[PDB]
Amino acid sequence: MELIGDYSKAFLLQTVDGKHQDLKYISPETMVALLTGKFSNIVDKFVIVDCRYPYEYEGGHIKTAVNLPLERDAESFLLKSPIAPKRVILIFHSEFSSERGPRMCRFIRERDRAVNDYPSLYYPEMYILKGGYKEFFPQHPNFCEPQDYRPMNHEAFKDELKTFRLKTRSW
Ligand SMILES: [Cl-]
Ligand SMILES: [Cl-]
């Protein structure tokens, strides 16, 4: 397997197959391994980036996850003042981690490359949580808060979906 983004070392986590062949995916179990400190001696810090809309996040998210659905906010939070460490790892996810999560992952790498001298990166190691929140919640409810799951297409949030999308950079 290839080295991480800055070609400094191998990827630390075991991966699983995912739709986007060029990205690295991890399972809910591996996400829990990170959250339970199984890699504390090597991983200084990791950030779980929930790329879903605010109402989805509010309806139930992974503990400690940060809601950064808008590209400009994800960039500001992660690259304005890079989180320095050991390793730093980013884990992106959305509802199914089919579109929004992967898109933000690619976006951050694009920006990371743009503000660095090749091949250096602030976040050389990034993963996608396979199955997204939809598959994580049924496996580890006590690692979520609140302990619920609100889909993007929830019937009671149709207006909220439209409101949020009109704030995005492109549709
Ligand atoms: Cl997938
Ligand atoms: Cl956006």
UniProtKB/Swiss-Prot annotation:
Function noted in UniProt: Tyrosine protein phosphatase which functions as a dosage-dependent inducer of mitotic progression. Directly dephosphorylates CDK1 and stimulates its kinase activity. Required for G2/M phases of the cell cycle progression and abscission during cytokinesis in a ECT2-dependent manner. The three isoforms seem to have a different level of activity.
Subunit structure and binding partners: Interacts with MAPK14 and 14-3-3 proteins.
Post-translational modification: Phosphorylated by BRSK1 in vitro. Phosphorylated by CHEK1, which inhibits the activity of this protein.
Any one of the GO BP annotations: positive regulation of mitotic cell cycle
GO cellular component: centrosome; cytoplasm; cytosol; nucleoplasm; nucleus; spindle pole
Protein's UniProt name: M-phase inducer phosphatase 2
Shown segment, full-protein numbering: 391 to 564 of 580
GO molecular function, one term: protein tyrosine phosphatase activity
Location (main, coarse): cytoplasm
Rhodanese domain location: 42-145
Name of the gene this protein is made from: CDC25B
Residue list for modification Phosphoserine: 81, 170
Taxonomy, superkingdom: Eukaryota
Residues of the active site: 94
Keywords: Cell cycle, Cell division, Cytoplasm, Cytoskeleton, Hydrolase, Mitosis, Phosphoprotein, Protein phosphatase
Similarity field: Belongs to the MPI phosphatase family.
Location of this chain's protein in the cell: Cytoplasm, Cytoskeleton, Microtubule organizing center, Centrosome; Cytoplasm, Cytoskeleton, Spindle pole
